PDB file of C-alpha atoms and ligand atoms in Angstrom:
ATOM      1  CA  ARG A   6     -41.393   9.083 120.251  1.00 36.84           C
ATOM      2  CA  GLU A   7     -41.909  12.253 122.241  1.00 38.17           C
ATOM      3  CA  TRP A   8     -39.091  14.906 121.806  1.00 39.27           C
ATOM      4  CA  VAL A   9     -37.172  14.670 125.112  1.00 34.67           C
ATOM      5  CA  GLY A  10     -34.123  16.250 123.636  1.00 31.44           C
ATOM      6  CA  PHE A  11     -36.163  19.448 123.016  1.00 31.30           C
ATOM      7  CA  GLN A  12     -36.603  19.778 126.699  1.00 34.81           C
ATOM      8  CA  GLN A  13     -32.838  20.085 127.083  1.00 34.63           C
ATOM      9  CA  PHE A  14     -32.263  22.946 124.681  1.00 35.00           C
ATOM     10  CA  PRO A  15     -31.775  26.324 126.264  1.00 35.73           C
ATOM     11  CA  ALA A  16     -34.761  28.600 126.223  1.00 35.93           C
ATOM     12  CA  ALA A  17     -33.367  30.807 123.574  1.00 34.10           C
ATOM     13  CA  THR A  18     -32.925  27.745 121.241  1.00 35.93           C
ATOM     14  CA  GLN A  19     -36.364  26.370 122.228  1.00 37.61           C
ATOM     15  CA  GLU A  20     -37.842  29.873 121.290  1.00 39.76           C
ATOM     16  CA  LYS A  21     -36.405  29.988 117.826  1.00 40.14           C
ATOM     17  CA  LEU A  22     -37.245  26.217 116.919  1.00 38.74           C
ATOM     18  CA  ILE A  23     -40.759  26.814 117.902  1.00 37.49           C
ATOM     19  CA  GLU A  24     -40.978  29.783 115.701  1.00 33.61           C
ATOM     20  CA  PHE A  25     -39.366  27.786 112.688  1.00 32.76           C
ATOM     21  CA  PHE A  26     -41.518  24.757 113.221  1.00 34.77           C
ATOM     22  CA  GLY A  27     -44.493  26.772 113.886  1.00 32.97           C
ATOM     23  CA  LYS A  28     -44.252  28.423 110.313  1.00 35.22           C
ATOM     24  CA  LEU A  29     -44.370  24.879 108.724  1.00 34.99           C
ATOM     25  CA  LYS A  30     -47.523  23.953 110.861  1.00 34.87           C
ATOM     26  CA  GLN A  31     -49.174  27.214 109.584  1.00 38.06           C
ATOM     27  CA  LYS A  32     -48.532  25.929 106.052  1.00 41.91           C
ATOM     28  CA  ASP A  33     -49.960  22.441 107.187  1.00 43.20           C
ATOM     29  CA  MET A  34     -46.753  20.785 107.073  1.00 43.48           C
ATOM     30  CA  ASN A  35     -47.000  18.965 110.350  1.00 43.32           C
ATOM     31  CA  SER A  36     -43.866  16.987 109.460  1.00 45.91           C
ATOM     32  CA  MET A  37     -40.473  17.224 107.805  1.00 48.77           C
ATOM     33  CA  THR A  38     -37.930  14.837 106.546  1.00 50.40           C
ATOM     34  CA  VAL A  39     -34.224  15.468 106.440  1.00 50.54           C
ATOM     35  CA  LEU A  40     -31.667  13.258 104.774  1.00 54.64           C
ATOM     36  CA  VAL A  41     -27.988  13.554 105.654  1.00 55.70           C
ATOM     37  CA  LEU A  42     -25.310  12.409 103.199  1.00 55.24           C
ATOM     38  CA  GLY A  43     -21.669  12.652 103.222  1.00 56.33           C
ATOM     39  CA  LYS A  44     -18.236  10.806 103.280  1.00 56.30           C
ATOM     40  CA  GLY A  45     -17.415   8.884 106.399  1.00 55.67           C
ATOM     41  CA  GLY A  46     -16.142  10.528 109.305  1.00 56.08           C
ATOM     42  CA  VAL A  47     -17.386  13.990 108.753  1.00 59.39           C
ATOM     43  CA  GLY A  48     -19.737  14.279 111.653  1.00 57.41           C
ATOM     44  CA  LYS A  49     -23.076  13.266 109.887  1.00 54.18           C
ATOM     45  CA  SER A  50     -24.230  11.179 113.169  1.00 52.99           C
ATOM     46  CA  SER A  51     -22.862  13.825 115.597  1.00 49.64           C
ATOM     47  CA  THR A  52     -24.848  16.557 113.694  1.00 51.25           C
ATOM     48  CA  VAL A  53     -28.041  14.435 113.875  1.00 54.42           C
ATOM     49  CA  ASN A  54     -27.586  13.889 117.836  1.00 55.65           C
ATOM     50  CA  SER A  55     -26.883  17.696 118.042  1.00 53.17           C
ATOM     51  CA  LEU A  56     -30.298  18.538 116.148  1.00 55.79           C
ATOM     52  CA  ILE A  57     -32.259  15.964 118.162  1.00 57.57           C
ATOM     53  CA  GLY A  58     -30.525  16.747 121.406  1.00 54.76           C
ATOM     54  CA  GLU A  59     -30.512  12.948 122.298  1.00 51.65           C
ATOM     55  CA  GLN A  60     -27.887  10.235 121.534  1.00 50.89           C
ATOM     56  CA  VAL A  61     -30.063   8.565 118.933  1.00 51.38           C
ATOM     57  CA  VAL A  62     -27.221   7.433 116.391  1.00 50.22           C
ATOM     58  CA  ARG A  63     -23.889   6.062 116.902  1.00 48.45           C
ATOM     59  CA  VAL A  64     -20.771   8.230 116.633  1.00 48.08           C
ATOM     60  CA  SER A  65     -17.362   6.789 116.336  1.00 50.65           C
ATOM     61  CA  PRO A  66     -13.854   7.615 114.908  1.00 50.24           C
ATOM     62  CA  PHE A  67     -14.246   4.498 112.634  1.00 49.63           C
ATOM     63  CA  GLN A  68     -16.783   3.655 110.181  1.00 51.88           C
ATOM     64  CA  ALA A  69     -18.928   0.563 111.491  1.00 53.56           C
ATOM     65  CA  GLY A  71     -21.398  -2.181 106.488  1.00 50.44           C
ATOM     66  CA  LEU A  72     -23.967  -0.151 108.212  1.00 49.18           C
ATOM     67  CA  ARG A  73     -27.514   0.608 107.182  1.00 51.31           C
ATOM     68  CA  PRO A  74     -29.434   3.818 106.911  1.00 52.25           C
ATOM     69  CA  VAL A  75     -31.481   4.757 109.933  1.00 51.06           C
ATOM     70  CA  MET A  76     -34.534   7.190 110.450  1.00 48.65           C
ATOM     71  CA  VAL A  77     -34.765   9.032 113.715  1.00 47.70           C
ATOM     72  CA  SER A  78     -38.166  10.553 114.458  1.00 45.85           C
ATOM     73  CA  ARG A  79     -39.250  12.808 117.268  1.00 44.09           C
ATOM     74  CA  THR A  80     -42.753  14.376 117.753  1.00 42.99           C
ATOM     75  CA  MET A  81     -43.810  17.378 119.745  1.00 41.02           C
ATOM     76  CA  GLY A  82     -47.052  19.318 119.902  1.00 36.73           C
ATOM     77  CA  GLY A  83     -48.388  17.631 116.628  1.00 35.35           C
ATOM     78  CA  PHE A  84     -45.111  18.309 114.677  1.00 34.28           C
ATOM     79  CA  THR A  85     -42.827  15.485 113.686  1.00 37.25           C
ATOM     80  CA  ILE A  86     -39.120  15.688 112.534  1.00 38.87           C
ATOM     81  CA  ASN A  87     -37.738  12.718 110.746  1.00 38.80           C
ATOM     82  CA  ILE A  88     -33.938  12.483 110.261  1.00 35.32           C
ATOM     83  CA  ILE A  89     -32.323  10.062 107.973  1.00 34.75           C
ATOM     84  CA  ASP A  90     -28.778   9.181 108.858  1.00 34.34           C
ATOM     85  CA  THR A  91     -26.664   7.209 106.559  1.00 35.87           C
ATOM     86  CA  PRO A  92     -23.400   5.169 105.870  1.00 36.45           C
ATOM     87  CA  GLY A  93     -20.553   7.181 104.302  1.00 35.61           C
ATOM     88  CA  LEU A  94     -20.316   7.470 100.589  1.00 33.83           C
ATOM     89  CA  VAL A  95     -16.564   6.641  99.984  1.00 32.76           C
ATOM     90  CA  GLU A  96     -14.667   3.389 100.596  1.00 31.90           C
ATOM     91  CA  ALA A  97     -11.214   2.790 100.162  1.00 36.96           C
ATOM     92  CA  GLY A  98     -10.549   5.817  97.879  1.00 38.11           C
ATOM     93  CA  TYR A  99     -13.809   5.292  95.753  1.00 38.02           C
ATOM     94  CA  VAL A 100     -17.334   6.208  95.904  1.00 35.67           C
ATOM     95  CA  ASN A 101     -19.247   3.404  97.688  1.00 34.34           C
ATOM     96  CA  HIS A 102     -22.089   2.842  95.094  1.00 35.75           C
ATOM     97  CA  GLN A 103     -23.569  -0.155  97.257  1.00 33.30           C
ATOM     98  CA  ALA A 104     -23.983   2.356 100.129  1.00 35.38           C
ATOM     99  CA  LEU A 105     -25.818   4.729  97.700  1.00 35.74           C
ATOM    100  CA  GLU A 106     -28.067   1.888  96.511  1.00 36.01           C
ATOM    101  CA  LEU A 107     -28.847   1.071  99.951  1.00 36.78           C
ATOM    102  CA  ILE A 108     -29.829   4.558 100.915  1.00 36.49           C
ATOM    103  CA  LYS A 109     -31.749   4.910  97.844  1.00 34.02           C
ATOM    104  CA  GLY A 110     -33.601   1.603  98.644  1.00 36.63           C
ATOM    105  CA  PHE A 111     -34.353   2.969 102.121  1.00 38.46           C
ATOM    106  CA  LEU A 112     -35.906   5.946 100.521  1.00 35.72           C
ATOM    107  CA  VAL A 113     -38.514   4.308  98.397  1.00 37.95           C
ATOM    108  CA  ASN A 114     -41.858   5.723  98.787  1.00 37.66           C
ATOM    109  CA  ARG A 115     -40.482   8.644 101.188  1.00 38.23           C
ATOM    110  CA  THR A 116     -40.551  12.294 100.465  1.00 37.90           C
ATOM    111  CA  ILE A 117     -37.184  14.172 101.487  1.00 36.89           C
ATOM    112  CA  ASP A 118     -37.804  17.846 102.127  1.00 38.33           C
ATOM    113  CA  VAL A 119     -34.185  18.849 102.699  1.00 40.85           C
ATOM    114  CA  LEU A 120     -30.721  17.139 102.177  1.00 41.88           C
ATOM    115  CA  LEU A 121     -27.914  17.952 104.266  1.00 38.42           C
ATOM    116  CA  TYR A 122     -24.649  17.327 102.309  1.00 39.58           C
ATOM    117  CA  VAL A 123     -22.097  17.320 105.251  1.00 41.96           C
ATOM    118  CA  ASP A 124     -18.231  17.722 105.184  1.00 43.59           C
ATOM    119  CA  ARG A 125     -15.691  19.200 107.618  1.00 41.89           C
ATOM    120  CA  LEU A 126     -14.461  22.786 107.649  1.00 39.04           C
ATOM    121  CA  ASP A 127     -11.044  21.964 108.840  1.00 38.11           C
ATOM    122  CA  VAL A 128      -9.800  20.516 105.414  1.00 38.37           C
ATOM    123  CA  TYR A 129      -7.422  22.118 103.075  1.00 37.33           C
ATOM    124  CA  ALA A 130      -8.487  20.950  99.561  1.00 34.30           C
ATOM    125  CA  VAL A 131     -11.269  19.306  97.666  1.00 30.35           C
ATOM    126  CA  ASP A 132     -10.145  16.437  95.415  1.00 30.00           C
ATOM    127  CA  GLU A 133     -11.422  14.432  92.567  1.00 30.30           C
ATOM    128  CA  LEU A 134     -13.270  11.940  94.962  1.00 33.02           C
ATOM    129  CA  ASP A 135     -15.365  14.950  96.236  1.00 32.98           C
ATOM    130  CA  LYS A 136     -16.558  15.597  92.798  1.00 35.56           C
ATOM    131  CA  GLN A 137     -17.124  11.840  92.283  1.00 38.58           C
ATOM    132  CA  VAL A 138     -19.241  11.892  95.428  1.00 38.21           C
ATOM    133  CA  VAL A 139     -21.259  14.669  93.920  1.00 40.23           C
ATOM    134  CA  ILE A 140     -21.623  13.041  90.418  1.00 38.83           C
ATOM    135  CA  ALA A 141     -22.816   9.735  92.346  1.00 42.64           C
ATOM    136  CA  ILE A 142     -25.549  11.716  94.299  1.00 43.32           C
ATOM    137  CA  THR A 143     -26.638  13.377  91.077  1.00 43.40           C
ATOM    138  CA  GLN A 144     -27.023  10.101  89.313  1.00 44.43           C
ATOM    139  CA  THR A 145     -28.917   8.366  92.369  1.00 44.37           C
ATOM    140  CA  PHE A 146     -31.409  11.134  92.956  1.00 45.47           C
ATOM    141  CA  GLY A 147     -31.292  13.580  90.010  1.00 44.59           C
ATOM    142  CA  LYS A 148     -30.057  17.031  89.523  1.00 44.12           C
ATOM    143  CA  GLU A 149     -33.066  18.497  91.395  1.00 44.22           C
ATOM    144  CA  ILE A 150     -31.842  17.317  94.843  1.00 45.41           C
ATOM    145  CA  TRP A 151     -29.368  20.277  94.767  1.00 44.09           C
ATOM    146  CA  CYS A 152     -32.309  22.763  94.943  1.00 40.45           C
ATOM    147  CA  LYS A 153     -33.256  21.218  98.244  1.00 36.60           C
ATOM    148  CA  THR A 154     -29.717  20.997  99.816  1.00 35.30           C
ATOM    149  CA  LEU A 155     -27.649  22.768 102.390  1.00 38.87           C
ATOM    150  CA  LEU A 156     -23.952  22.578 102.678  1.00 39.54           C
ATOM    151  CA  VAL A 157     -23.252  21.835 106.298  1.00 42.64           C
ATOM    152  CA  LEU A 158     -19.615  22.228 107.523  1.00 39.98           C
ATOM    153  CA  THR A 159     -18.685  20.515 110.788  1.00 42.85           C
ATOM    154  CA  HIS A 160     -15.698  21.333 113.156  1.00 39.96           C
ATOM    155  CA  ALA A 161     -16.700  25.045 112.904  1.00 39.71           C
ATOM    156  CA  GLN A 162     -14.622  25.999 115.888  1.00 41.72           C
ATOM    157  CA  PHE A 163     -11.431  25.414 113.948  1.00 42.84           C
ATOM    158  CA  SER A 164      -8.600  28.015 114.151  1.00 42.60           C
ATOM    159  CA  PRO A 165      -6.463  28.167 111.179  1.00 41.16           C
ATOM    160  CA  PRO A 166      -2.661  28.088 111.676  1.00 40.32           C
ATOM    161  CA  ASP A 167      -0.141  30.896 111.345  1.00 37.52           C
ATOM    162  CA  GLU A 168      -1.404  34.230 109.683  1.00 35.61           C
ATOM    163  CA  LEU A 169      -4.496  33.034 108.184  1.00 35.21           C
ATOM    164  CA  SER A 170      -7.822  34.383 109.137  1.00 33.87           C
ATOM    165  CA  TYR A 171     -10.808  32.246 109.940  1.00 33.18           C
ATOM    166  CA  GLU A 172     -13.032  34.187 107.514  1.00 33.32           C
ATOM    167  CA  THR A 173     -10.508  33.707 104.656  1.00 32.20           C
ATOM    168  CA  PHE A 174     -10.044  30.035 105.366  1.00 33.49           C
ATOM    169  CA  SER A 175     -13.803  29.264 105.748  1.00 31.29           C
ATOM    170  CA  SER A 176     -14.754  31.279 102.625  1.00 31.47           C
ATOM    171  CA  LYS A 177     -12.324  29.459 100.484  1.00 34.85           C
ATOM    172  CA  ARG A 178     -13.406  26.062 101.864  1.00 36.97           C
ATOM    173  CA  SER A 179     -17.175  26.715 101.330  1.00 32.76           C
ATOM    174  CA  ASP A 180     -16.446  28.200  97.775  1.00 33.88           C
ATOM    175  CA  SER A 181     -14.304  25.164  96.906  1.00 37.16           C
ATOM    176  CA  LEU A 182     -17.023  22.736  97.955  1.00 37.52           C
ATOM    177  CA  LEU A 183     -19.759  24.848  96.132  1.00 39.63           C
ATOM    178  CA  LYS A 184     -17.707  24.794  93.104  1.00 40.54           C
ATOM    179  CA  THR A 185     -17.305  21.103  93.283  1.00 40.60           C
ATOM    180  CA  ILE A 186     -21.181  20.774  93.709  1.00 37.91           C
ATOM    181  CA  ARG A 187     -21.638  22.835  90.495  1.00 37.82           C
ATOM    182  CA  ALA A 188     -19.171  20.657  88.498  1.00 38.54           C
ATOM    183  CA  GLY A 189     -20.508  17.259  89.776  1.00 38.90           C
ATOM    184  CA  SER A 190     -23.970  18.346  89.148  1.00 37.89           C
ATOM    185  CA  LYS A 191     -23.287  19.722  85.654  1.00 39.90           C
ATOM    186  CA  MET A 192     -25.279  22.747  86.421  1.00 37.10           C
ATOM    187  CA  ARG A 193     -24.702  25.853  84.368  1.00 37.69           C
ATOM    188  CA  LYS A 194     -23.634  29.047  86.137  1.00 37.46           C
ATOM    189  CA  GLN A 195     -27.111  30.559  86.414  1.00 35.39           C
ATOM    190  CA  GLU A 196     -28.845  27.317  87.048  1.00 38.10           C
ATOM    191  CA  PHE A 197     -26.296  26.876  89.999  1.00 36.91           C
ATOM    192  CA  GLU A 198     -26.959  30.420  91.062  1.00 41.01           C
ATOM    193  CA  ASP A 199     -30.684  29.706  91.098  1.00 42.28           C
ATOM    194  CA  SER A 200     -30.367  26.515  93.218  1.00 41.42           C
ATOM    195  CA  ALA A 201     -29.288  29.051  95.936  1.00 43.20           C
ATOM    196  CA  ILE A 202     -27.277  26.380  98.060  1.00 42.68           C
ATOM    197  CA  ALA A 203     -26.758  27.952 101.475  1.00 42.08           C
ATOM    198  CA  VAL A 204     -23.605  27.164 103.665  1.00 43.97           C
ATOM    199  CA  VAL A 205     -24.337  26.429 107.478  1.00 46.77           C
ATOM    200  CA  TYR A 206     -21.762  25.762 110.097  1.00 51.58           C
ATOM    201  CA  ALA A 207     -21.730  23.246 113.054  1.00 51.45           C
ATOM    202  CA  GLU A 208     -19.657  22.411 115.866  1.00 49.01           C
ATOM    203  CA  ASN A 209     -20.482  19.121 117.451  1.00 49.93           C
ATOM    204  CA  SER A 210     -17.654  19.238 120.004  1.00 48.54           C
ATOM    205  CA  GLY A 211     -18.413  19.115 123.851  1.00 47.45           C
ATOM    206  CA  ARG A 212     -15.784  21.833 123.951  1.00 45.20           C
ATOM    207  CA  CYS A 213     -17.914  24.263 121.714  1.00 42.63           C
ATOM    208  CA  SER A 214     -17.991  27.740 122.827  1.00 48.04           C
ATOM    209  CA  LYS A 215     -21.351  29.103 124.224  1.00 47.66           C
ATOM    210  CA  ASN A 216     -23.001  32.416 123.899  1.00 49.14           C
ATOM    211  CA  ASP A 217     -24.272  34.513 126.655  1.00 51.76           C
ATOM    212  CA  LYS A 218     -27.812  32.525 126.514  1.00 51.51           C
ATOM    213  CA  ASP A 219     -25.790  29.201 126.970  1.00 51.35           C
ATOM    214  CA  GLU A 220     -26.412  28.184 123.371  1.00 51.68           C
ATOM    215  CA  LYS A 221     -23.622  26.358 121.501  1.00 49.74           C
ATOM    216  CA  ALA A 222     -21.961  29.222 119.340  1.00 53.36           C
ATOM    217  CA  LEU A 223     -19.918  29.657 116.142  1.00 51.88           C
ATOM    218  CA  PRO A 224     -16.777  31.894 116.500  1.00 49.17           C
ATOM    219  CA  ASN A 225     -19.089  34.727 115.244  1.00 49.63           C
ATOM    220  CA  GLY A 226     -21.132  34.092 118.472  1.00 50.23           C
ATOM    221  CA  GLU A 227     -24.225  32.968 116.750  1.00 51.07           C
ATOM    222  CA  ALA A 228     -26.268  29.991 118.070  1.00 50.19           C
ATOM    223  CA  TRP A 229     -25.569  27.328 115.271  1.00 53.52           C
ATOM    224  CA  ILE A 230     -28.422  24.810 116.148  1.00 49.58           C
ATOM    225  CA  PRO A 231     -31.063  27.455 115.626  1.00 49.48           C
ATOM    226  CA  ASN A 232     -29.233  28.717 112.533  1.00 50.95           C
ATOM    227  CA  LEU A 233     -29.145  25.176 111.015  1.00 50.44           C
ATOM    228  CA  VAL A 234     -32.962  24.686 111.917  1.00 47.90           C
ATOM    229  CA  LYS A 235     -33.641  27.964 110.314  1.00 50.58           C
ATOM    230  CA  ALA A 236     -31.907  26.869 107.125  1.00 49.18           C
ATOM    231  CA  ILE A 237     -33.603  23.506 107.066  1.00 53.17           C
ATOM    232  CA  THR A 238     -37.067  25.032 107.469  1.00 52.58           C
ATOM    233  CA  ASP A 239     -36.311  27.496 104.806  1.00 49.93           C
ATOM    234  CA  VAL A 240     -35.437  24.760 102.436  1.00 52.23           C
ATOM    235  CA  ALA A 241     -38.538  22.698 103.474  1.00 51.17           C
ATOM    236  CA  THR A 242     -40.650  25.561 102.455  1.00 51.15           C
ATOM    237  CA  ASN A 243     -38.913  26.916  99.472  1.00 50.98           C
ATOM    238  CA  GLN A 244     -41.692  25.622  97.244  1.00 49.35           C
ATOM    239  CA  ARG A 245     -39.175  23.718  95.044  1.00 49.80           C
ATOM    240  CA  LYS A 246     -40.583  20.383  94.796  1.00 51.38           C
ATOM    241  CA  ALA A 247     -39.451  17.728  97.442  1.00 52.12           C
ATOM    242  CA  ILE A 248     -37.489  14.764  96.442  1.00 54.71           C
ATOM    243  CA  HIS A 249     -39.522  11.587  95.996  1.00 53.75           C
ATOM    244  CA  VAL A 250     -37.761   8.201  95.238  1.00 51.46           C
TER     245      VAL A 250
HETATM  246  N1  GDP B 301     -14.137  18.559 116.914  1.00 48.65           N
HETATM  247  C1  GDP B 301     -15.208  18.017 116.332  1.00 48.65           C
HETATM  248  N2  GDP B 301     -15.280  16.676 116.172  1.00 48.65           N
HETATM  249  C2  GDP B 301     -16.394  16.141 115.603  1.00 48.65           C
HETATM  250  C3  GDP B 301     -17.401  16.975 114.929  1.00 48.65           C
HETATM  251  N3  GDP B 301     -18.437  16.154 114.424  1.00 48.65           N
HETATM  252  C4  GDP B 301     -17.888  14.973 114.617  1.00 48.65           C
HETATM  253  N4  GDP B 301     -16.757  14.899 115.232  1.00 48.65           N
HETATM  254  C5  GDP B 301     -16.080  13.660 115.691  1.00 48.65           C
HETATM  255  O1  GDP B 301     -15.632  13.120 114.460  1.00 48.65           O
HETATM  256  C6  GDP B 301     -15.844  11.562 114.580  1.00 48.65           C
HETATM  257  C7  GDP B 301     -16.794  11.109 113.493  1.00 48.65           C
HETATM  258  O2  GDP B 301     -18.085  11.635 113.910  1.00 48.65           O
HETATM  259  P1  GDP B 301     -19.306  10.912 113.365  1.00 48.65           P
HETATM  260  O3  GDP B 301     -20.512  11.768 113.859  1.00 48.65           O
HETATM  261  O4  GDP B 301     -19.392   9.373 113.600  1.00 48.65           O
HETATM  262  O5  GDP B 301     -19.144  11.029 111.697  1.00 48.65           O
HETATM  263  P2  GDP B 301     -19.900  10.265 110.419  1.00 48.65           P
HETATM  264  O6  GDP B 301     -19.206   9.006 110.084  1.00 48.65           O
HETATM  265  O7  GDP B 301     -19.971  11.311 109.399  1.00 48.65           O
HETATM  266  O8  GDP B 301     -21.222   9.812 110.862  1.00 48.65           O
HETATM  267  C8  GDP B 301     -16.234  11.426 115.938  1.00 48.65           C
HETATM  268  O9  GDP B 301     -15.135  10.916 116.655  1.00 48.65           O
HETATM  269  C9  GDP B 301     -16.801  12.645 116.462  1.00 48.65           C
HETATM  270  O10 GDP B 301     -16.735  12.982 117.822  1.00 48.65           O
HETATM  271  C10 GDP B 301     -17.241  18.428 115.162  1.00 48.65           C
HETATM  272  O11 GDP B 301     -18.159  19.214 114.771  1.00 48.65           O
HETATM  273  N5  GDP B 301     -16.152  18.939 115.762  1.00 48.65           N
HETATM  274 MG1   MG B 302     -22.447   8.105 111.244  1.00 51.64          MG
END
């Protein structure tokens, strides 16, 4: 479908997205496919709707047995495909049936970028997070991690008491990255080489805006263009995409 949501982005965001997608088109990539994975309730669907700028997937405090969905939008000969998914944990365990459904849904498809999504405003990683990584590695292979971005939602979180945002967020992202390294079995150099970048998101209607009317992080940066910059970076990193 035509990309109506694009028209609703502020000019400053439009400008950046055109630059990013324009770079892909120059390399004769006239489309890209983004897979989104995560536990339930972390804002996967919300982040998808933020990226498309339309209500294309269902958001809810409760996890609906639901199926993967591909949302596709096209503009000036360029097409973005984003695959939203059911959560990867159920009742304190990894949901392997969800993973198999997702994998089944991906047959024949080429995945340019994985977004592995979790919340910023969480105080610990636990064994379940590592098991989610382990299961993703078993389903798609170790190589998925060289095409992945860690996306942390609820970025407008303000930590309690004396704690700085920067200390809290660097600890949260570090702990997750170390979990990815552990669950993927990657050696320290191998892991450094995968170069997994951390991107922040705030899907709340109450998100701060910068002075160009763009949804902004506490540092003032426009987060939707940041995330698109990171996606298009990974899409064109010349590591091989993920075929299933
Ligand atoms: N404050 C805030 N709430 C969010 C954010 N992302 C999602 N939510 C809320 O968290 C709940 C789950 O969101 P959803 O997108 O359905 O998560 P999913 O199960 O991972 O697909 C919903 O009630 C959303 O409104 C975020 O960045 N900030
Ligand atoms: Mg969802």
